């Protein structure tokens, strides 16, 4: 990367936005998010992703539920009403920058 | 803002992108960048801007020159060839995120 500082900041923002995008659409597990973000070309690990999930919930933008399904306890995340509003604002900001410089 | 953490990260990235965009197009003084970024709705001060200019130059993406014009010494910044290449990569990253989530 010619500009690793841009890429680092932008990637943090991108990851956050992708998480909200996916969690608004359906319930998601962290394990699946790691794979889906990776598919899209974002370098993430459970070690980096789970703390961002937890922070998103602390921010009120996700809510999680522990479920026991098929004998295994797992945590699923979904967007809250505040998270859907955030998703709209975050996307708007992205759309504006894209319109301005491209 | 519903998501201040997204807005903080995204704005740092946006400002960096704008700086390269302006410095590729012309030579710039810091004082003018402050005004131009402010016009566009970015909250920037000399305290935030000058350190990012310095880091951009350290990264080889900008070069600055102290220049005496009309009897007054000022520092001007412009993009280097590496900075122009970075601008292209940063734009590509923006384009990709726009495709993914919009
Ligand atoms: Cl760096
Ligand atoms: Cl978890």
From Swiss-Prot, chains A, B:
InterPro entries: Metal_resp_DNA-bind_regulator, Tscrpt_reg_PadR_N, WH-like_DNA-bd_sf, WH_DNA-bd_sf. Cd(2+) binds at residues 22, 36, 40. The keyword Transcription regulation applies. Pfam families: PadR. Homodimer. Contains an N-terminal winged-helix-turn-helix (wHTH) DNA-binding domain and a C-terminal alpha helix, which is mainly involved in dimerization. Binding of cadmium causes subtle conformational changes in all key metal-binding residues and conserved DNA-binding residues. This is Transcriptional regulator Rv3488. It comes from Mycobacterium tuberculosis (strain ATCC 25618 / H37Rv).
